[PDB]
From a paper:
In this report we show that the ligase ClxA, from Clostridium cavendishii, initially reported to have roles in amide bond formation in the biosynthesis of benzoxazole antibiotics, is an effective catalyst for the formation of phenyl benzoate esters from acid and phenol substrates using ATP in an aqueous medium. ClxA was also reported to accept alternative substrates for coupling, including 3,5-dichlorobenzoic acid, which could be coupled to 3,4-AHBA 1 to form a precursor of an analog of the bioactive compound tafamidis. ClxA therefore presents as a possible biocatalytic tool for the synthesis of pharmaceutical-type amides, particularly those that use anilines as the amine partner, as these had proven to be poorer substrates for the amide bond synthetases McbA12,13 and ShABS14 studied by our groups previously.
The observations on both chemoselectivity and substrate specificity of ClxA prompted us to initiate structural studies as a precursor to structure-guided mutagenesis. Two datasets for ClxA were obtained (SI Section S6): The first was an apo- structure with no ligands bound; the second was obtained following co-crystallisation with both ATP and 3,4-AHBA 1 and features the ligand density described below. In each of the two datasets there were four molecules in the asymmetric unit. The structure of NatL2 and ClxA are characteristic of a subset of adenylases in which the active sites are completed by reciprocal sharing of an extension to the C-terminal cap domain. ClxA, with only 29% sequence identity to NatL2, features many local differences in secondary structure compared to NatL2: for example, NatL2 features a longer N-terminus and C-terminus and an ordered helix (P373–R388) that is replaced by a shorter region of less well-defined helical character (D353 to N362) in ClxA.
Author numbering:
A (entry chain A): 3 to 401
B (entry chain B): 4 to 401
């Protein structure tokens, strides 16, 4: 049934248009098809920024339950009220695919509970299956990586969750503490989210931790649009309608990569009608061997993370996919990307310098691997510090 | 008493599931509070020596949350919780305290990192249908400047945070030309995690123009007590509180003493006669609030006692007298130095006090040393905003 999906898209509009923002550019216009839908104006990040938090609201103050934002201080941020239902929906989305949380599971939650949502909805999800949350958080004086390393050694949790960046550092700090988190033999699964994950970097994470990885694709304003199957592919949540548009035309593509627009099927506080995530990807419709009937998504990363020389363009994913076919000797787990004077330079902490003259990348553009020394791009001494913290110290005996 | 005694016994029967408690309590029953008071105290330093699996009376399946001493300075105390237990903690916050309505938007300035107050306040607030703004604390993500803007923008109806932070919040905000009081949106405050004199409570109320509710709790127990409308803490029904003599360690007949607590309603690892290391006293005069539960007077930590040769006072008693002085000579920023057998209170304030004819109505000598605003507490340290964003892996050069 398109009949259902179309019923839903319409509901979403009827709620949305409770709010000035949505009414003064969608009125009471109904729709009869996806194509008639695709005629409707996109909703941009920069649109929502201009909104007071009371302008980003389709429910009564009474139904408010949580609040969230852009964690980033760089750029005006986006109010995202949630009702209990909405919050609970987000959580269910994490459970819809992803790893199978058991009650016997103890889960180290390394996502920031400060203002972001992934921390909170993962908790929601995990509690739902009867498992235990260790609220370590992130970017808190309270829980630097040394402590997290000790926490894992001590508590032996069965699942780690954290943005793949932090998880790579965690393993570095821990290895500098003479701890192989992998050999503990207690971590069966990982939950990455908050940055795009190549199959190459996913396979890196799996080799480090010796665990299966489940990746979760979401955002504050929407919820969690997709997550990994056992086979490794993201799948799209039933609570969303995902379109792939052409960067320039802004029309549905016939196939292949494109801008990722999402509409909320199941969020009532302020629904996302055709929201421009600003990412790149593609929906496949071949049924995954996992057996799940929902459609697979290939995430190519953010739009600004496209690699554009004169001689072509590639997605950050495509770049990464090729980087990480090279040995760890030449690439490693710490890298950044400079595009300058019409060349692509990947700077990598690694032991060996690469031929480059015999690099033999299978990309439509030229990419060089510039070698660095471990610790030069990522300073380990910055991560190992522990600030002592406690309650205020008001009463001093000078003895 | 038959109820309370039934409960104390249950607590022991669970507790002794754990070697820690069994190898010093066996299956000993009790018939009275007095027979209870014969049992060995449980100390902070006791629990520290426990592996997290040794601090556990339930199966891994029933585990739900985990927590610790937030400080990275000093070995920490494992505190598992089951869903029930967590839910109990929350209910304790709701048992007295402020009355959370569904029309309430609450800025939650407690750290969600490892501590519990942040999480159980959320629990409580959701329970009444109100909205949580999870600002947290000690996170790069949420410096005071942002919190000030967040309040200006979202106009929340309730702030929650340790009174120290809340005093700073108002400083940072006032330096940003924002009077949080004149917003007209904050009706209530929820202090916790440090002791609160009636004088400092009244200070907070003057700053924010809101009523204060204080909450007295700890990670291992839950939240043992919270304020009534009248101002007085009351003890939660989920706990048995004793006041012991500092030296003898026997029930006192009346007055101040060491505060020991037993968990009536926590099953993962119950606190049997736990030494908080605080000082206080139970009154049984009924508060005019009409709540029948007994009032508690919190005097602060033991190490925060003021001991000269010429006597001794509680941090509260000291504070209570400090803050009867004009605002001109005592503000909201103070510290306490005891040196060469004198008590010096250093205060940011405009006027110097005529200590040569000082009022102070205490059994010991206490001098008020005047300082300039911003010299004890540097506002410039707090106004910084650290830029944070996702990782930045792709750079276009030039
Ligand atoms: Mg469990
Ligand atoms: Mg509400
Ligand atoms: Zn699949
Ligand atoms: Zn009362």
């Amino acid at each position: 049934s398109n009949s259902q999906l179309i019923t839903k898209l319409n509901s979403a509009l009827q709620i949305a248009t409770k709010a000035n923002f949505y009414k003064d550019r969608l009125g009471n216009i109904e729709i009869k098809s996806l194509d008639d839908f695709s005629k409707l104006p996109l909703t941009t990040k920069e649109d929502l920024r201009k909104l007071k938090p009371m302008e980003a609201l389709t429910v009564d103050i009474e139904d408010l339950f949580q609040y969230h934002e852009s964690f980033g201080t760089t750029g005006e941020p986006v109010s995202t009220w949630l009702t209990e239902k909405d919050f609970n929906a987000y959580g269910d989305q994490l459970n819809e695919f992803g790893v199978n949380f058991k009650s016997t599971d103890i889960v180290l939650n390394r996502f920031p509970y400060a203002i972001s949502v992934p921390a909170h909805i993962f908790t929601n999800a995990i509690h739902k299956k009867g498992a235990c949350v260790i609220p370590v958080s992130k970017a808190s004086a309270i829980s630097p990586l040394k402590r997290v390393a000790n926490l894992i050694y001590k508590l032996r949790p069965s699942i780690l969750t954290g943005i793949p960046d932090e998880l790579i550092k965690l393993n570095k700090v821990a290895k500098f503490m003479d701890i192989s988190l992998k050999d503990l033999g207690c971590i069966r699964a990982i939950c990455t989210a908050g940055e795009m994950l190549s199959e190459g970097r996913k396979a890196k994470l799996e080799s480090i931790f010796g665990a299966k990885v489940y990746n979760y694709y979401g955002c504050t304003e929407c919820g969690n649009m997709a997550a990994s199957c056992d086979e490794g592919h993201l799948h799209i949540s039933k609570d969303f309608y995902v379109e792939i548009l052409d960067p320039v035309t802004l029309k549905p593509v016939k196939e292949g990569k494109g801008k990722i627009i999402v509409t909320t099927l199941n969020k009532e506080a302020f629904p996302m009608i055709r929201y421009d995530l600003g990412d790149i990807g593609e929906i496949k419709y071949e049924k995954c061997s996992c057996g799940n009937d929902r459609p697979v998504l290939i995430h190519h990363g953010r739009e600004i993370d496209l690699i554009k020389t004169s001689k072509g363009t590639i997605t950050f994913k495509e770049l990464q996919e090729e980087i990480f076919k090279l040995p760890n000797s030449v690439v490693g787990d710490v890298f950044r990307v400079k595009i300058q004077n019409d060349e692509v330079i990947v700077e990598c902490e690694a032991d060996e310098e690469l031929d480059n003259s015999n690099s033999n990348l299978n990309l439509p553009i030229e990419v060089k691997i510039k070698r660095f020394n471990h610790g030069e791009i990522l300073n380990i001494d910055n991560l190992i510090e522990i600030k002592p913290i406690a309650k205020p110290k008001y009463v001093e005996y000078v003895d």
